[PDB]
Design a protein around this ligand. Structure first.
Ligand SMILES: *[C@@H]1O[C@H](CO)[C@@H](O[C@@H]2O[C@H](CO)[C@@H](O[C@@H]3O[C@H](CO[C@H]4O[C@H](CO)[C@@H](O)[C@H](O)[C@@H]4O)[C@@H](O)[C@H](O)[C@@H]3O)[C@H](O)[C@H]2NC(C)=O)[C@H](O)[C@H]1NC(C)=O
Ligand SMILES: *[C@@H]1O[C@H](CO)[C@@H](O[C@@H]2O[C@H](CO)[C@@H](O[C@@H]3O[C@H](CO)[C@@H](O)[C@H](O)[C@@H]3O)[C@H](O)[C@H]2NC(C)=O)[C@H](O)[C@H]1NC(C)=O
Ligand SMILES: *[C@@H]1O[C@H](CO)[C@@H](O[C@@H]2O[C@H](CO)[C@@H](O[C@@H]3O[C@H](CO)[C@@H](O)[C@H](O)[C@@H]3O)[C@H](O)[C@H]2NC(C)=O)[C@H](O)[C@H]1NC(C)=O
Ligand SMILES: *[C@@H]1O[C@H](CO)[C@@H](O[C@@H]2O[C@H](CO)[C@@H](O)[C@H](O)[C@H]2NC(C)=O)[C@H](O)[C@H]1NC(C)=O
Ligand SMILES: *[C@@H]1O[C@H](CO)[C@@H](O[C@@H]2O[C@H](CO)[C@@H](O)[C@H](O)[C@H]2NC(C)=O)[C@H](O)[C@H]1NC(C)=O
Ligand SMILES: *[C@@H]1O[C@H](CO)[C@@H](O[C@@H]2O[C@H](CO)[C@@H](O)[C@H](O)[C@H]2NC(C)=O)[C@H](O)[C@H]1NC(C)=O
Ligand SMILES: *[C@@H]1O[C@H](CO)[C@@H](O[C@@H]2O[C@H](CO)[C@@H](O)[C@H](O)[C@H]2NC(C)=O)[C@H](O)[C@H]1NC(C)=O
Lengths: 226, 216, 76, 48
């Protein structure tokens, strides 16, 4: 059952990617921002910045040097400021990418190479494994997670009195299906008979709030009687 | 989490209501179109920052009318119906501490303050009634007194310690919360990390306005 | 067809009592979208389904079955 | 943004779960945290 659910879950990824273009928006925006920033830099060459012409050769081809020198200075100041604006934008944007690159490296180490107890760090659910995939200027992680599906209402109790002593579960909770008391795991309903091997003793009945009455079956008793 | 979503316009800041100045500005190419883009980019992610922090629950859980949480007392952090903006008592304390004509405007945040409180209630209401289970999948209820027993196991303390000491632990929790109210109600400096963000943006914006008085 | 909102005066959008998820953010909790003859509407956006938990001091819900899911996380 | 990313991390690993990370969720052995809103920020009450 688990293997078949995994295989179908992977198949859905192919169907999702093959139809929804917006899935890769985080990487397309990086490509678009750099192309958009670079085109603005190119367009700035068409500006006059106060000079008589945006073309440098037309100033030289029409003015003799003592006059051209002032007209050129306007183009140099405008074009030099344009580069400083572009470079500053890239330095800030590059820092943003590095933080993502550092985050991607962290996930690779703690999600692919191991298994995380960090909540929602490796996908929503209880993390099992992740698989890296490459992409243009980025990385794609497939996170395999365990999600509880179907639940029932059980009556519970924090402890059990049997012989005046309070018995607590070793692992899991006490549940009742209405008439009988069992001990079961946390994340998967699997009832078990309450024995001396499931529980431990501490104190007596008078201090814990909500203790109930039952019997803790002792497996050793029938072995010595027979 | 976020800061003010300001917006600035050149044509009224550099050349405010002047035809001769505006025509000269066009000789500098697309500087303002580039600048108005940069400020818009900041303004948009300011809504993303709030979205990532609070919008982490897909459903708005809410606590039962009966507050039998095993002796623990959350009345100082659960919503207060007596306010038009359903904020808790402590939230009210926090909001009471943290405090033009030149093309400078402020955009309103996309998530209104009423919606922010509603998200924190759902995150809080889930925590008491469902433990950590509401984070992974569907919220599975569990008595709060038992919820602590498995929080104690998470730090290597056997769960019988909680049950045999349930009244003592609950009373220590209730007093610890009460001290938070006394701390906030008297010490203004507690919120310095948020007041500095407000002050830096107002201080930066006033410098921009003063620059109009310079001759250059 | 004029709708006054806290972010400004919205003209051309049909104000709706219902509440949906945000499609095109406007501000102050108002979003707009193109849906049903069809026109642009404006509404107060919703945060999600309202769902109380059946809390009680002796009742626990324990999952009996599970699902394995695969999600895609994309990072530059 | 770095603070907003940090706040989102704490919300996930401190409110929605329980951390074994030392001093990430308050000084001591972490039990639970409760979020509270604030003007342009978030306030966490860490129970340790
Ligand atoms: C826990 O949940 C699981 C699903 O989340 C449950 O597994 C499902 O169990 C039901 C009933 O036994 C199956 O439904 C029947 O399937 C048979 C044969 O299935 C074939 O066809 C399906 C549809 O194409 C295909 O997916 C399968 O792989 C088989 O090739 C049909 O003849 C019946 O008409 C009926 O549909 C589900 O197929 C099955 N799902 C999976 C993924 O295996 C499981 O029973 C639950 N456990 C408990 C304890 O409740
Ligand atoms: C809660 O769980 C308990 C434990 O399983 C249930 O008690 C069990 O109930 C079943 C159904 O009546 C009994 O099965 C019967 O067993 C006899 C042999 O004793 C057999 O001849 C019948 O044909 C039938 O299969 C089972 O014996 C019984 N277990 C015990 C220890 O008495 C109980 O019914 C459950 N309650 C609810 C509300 O689900
Ligand atoms: C779980 O079972 C135990 C024992 O079967 C229950 O304890 C019993 O409680 C009753 C009444 O609470 C006690 O009766 C009292 O006896 C004294 C004399 O000892 C008498 O003076 C009173 O007037 C009353 O009749 C009974 O003695 C006591 N048995 C033992 C062994 O302590 C317990 O109440 C059960 N749990 C629950 C939740 O009911
Ligand atoms: C769980 O909470 C319920 C709340 O009603 C408790 O039931 C009440 O318990 C008090 C004393 O503990 C009685 O005086 C009331 O009559 C009870 N109400 C009802 C409707 O029965 C219940 O006791 C709590 N569980 C435990 C184990 O104490
Ligand atoms: C949780 O704490 C609040 C805060 O003290 C309690 O509210 C007090 O209730 C008593 C009696 O009901 C009043 O005399 C006080 O004036 C209240 N204080 C405030 C600030 O409102 C509340 O009762 C506590 N929870 C429980 C279940 O008792
Ligand atoms: C939908 O909202 C409109 C308002 O946008 C409601 O119209 C108002 O109805 C109240 C009656 O309770 C009147 O007092 C107001 O004068 C109405 N507004 C206007 C502008 O006239 C309408 O009733 C709501 N309908 C539903 C089904 O929720
Ligand atoms: C566990 O029991 C509770 C209450 O007995 C169920 O919650 C009720 O569900 C019905 C329909 O399923 C609703 O009409 C009620 O309003 C609910 N009550 C409350 C207080 O929420 C709950 O569905 C049960 N759990 C399961 C898995 O069946």
């Amino acid at each position: 059952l688990i293997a078949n659910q995994f295989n179908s879950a992977i198949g859905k990824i192919q169907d999702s990617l093959s139809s929804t273009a917006s899935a890769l928006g985080k990487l397309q925006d990086v490509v678009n921002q750099n192309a958009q920033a670079l085109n603005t830099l190119v367009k700035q060459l068409s500006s006059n910045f106060g000079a008589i012409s945006s073309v440098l050769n037309d100033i030289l081809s029409r003015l003799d040097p003592p006059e051209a020198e002032v007209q050129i200075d306007r183009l140099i100041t405008g074009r030099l400021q344009s580069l400083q604006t572009y470079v500053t934008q890239q330095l800030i944007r590059a820092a943003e990418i590095r933080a993502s690159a550092n985050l991607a490296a962290t996930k690779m180490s703690e999600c692919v190479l191991g298994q995380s107890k960090r909540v929602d760090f490796c996908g929503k659910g209880y993390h099992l494994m992740s698989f890296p995939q490459s992409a243009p200027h980025g990385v794609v992680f497939l996170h395999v997670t365990y999600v509880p599906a179907q639940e029932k209402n059980f009556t519970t109790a924090p402890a059990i009195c049997h012989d005046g002593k309070a018995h607590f579960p070793r692992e899991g909770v006490f549940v009742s299906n209405g008439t009988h008391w069992f001990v079961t795991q946390r994340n998967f309903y699997e009832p078990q008979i309450i024995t001396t091997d499931n529980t431990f003793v501490s104190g007596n009945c008078d201090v814990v709030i909500g203790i109930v009455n039952n019997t803790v079956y002792d497996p050793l008793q029938p072995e010595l009687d027979s | 989490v976020s800061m003010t979503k300001t917006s600035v316009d050149c044509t009224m800041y550099i050349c405010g209501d002047s035809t001769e100045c505006s025509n000269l500005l066009l000789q500098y190419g697309s500087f303002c179109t580039q600048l108005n883009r940069a400020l818009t980019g900041i303004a948009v992610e300011q809504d993303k920052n709030t979205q990532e922090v609070f919008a982490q629950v897909k459903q708005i859980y809410k606590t039962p009318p009966i507050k039998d949480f095993g002796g623990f007392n959350f009345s100082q952090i659960l919503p207060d119906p007596s306010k038009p903006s359903k904020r808790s008592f402590i939230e009210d304390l926090l909001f009471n501490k943290v405090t033009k004509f030149n093309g400078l405007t402020v955009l309103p945040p996309l998530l209104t303050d009423e919606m922010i409180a509603q998200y924190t209630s759902a995150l809080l209401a889930g925590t008491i009634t469902s433990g950590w289970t509401f984070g992974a999948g569907a919220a599975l209820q569990i008595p709060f007194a038992m919820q602590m027993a498995y929080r104690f196991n998470g730090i290597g303390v056997t769960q019988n310690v909680l049950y045999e000491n349930q009244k003592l632990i609950a009373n220590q929790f209730n007093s610890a919360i009460g001290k938070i109210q006394d701390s906030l109600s008297s010490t203004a400096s507690a919120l310095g990390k948020l007041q500095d963000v407000v002050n830096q943006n107002a201080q930066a914006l006033n410098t921009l306005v003063k620059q109009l008085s310079s001759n250059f | 067809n004029v709708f006054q909102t806290r972010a400004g005066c919205l003209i051309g959008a049909e104000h709706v009592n219902n509440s949906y998820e945000c499609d095109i953010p406007i501000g102050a909790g108002i979003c707009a979208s193109y849906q049903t003859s069809q026109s642009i509407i404006a509404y107060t956006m919703s945060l999600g389904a309202e769902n109380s938990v059946a809390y009680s001091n002796n009742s626990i819900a324990i999952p009996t079955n599970f699902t394995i899911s695969v999600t895609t996380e994309i990072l530059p």
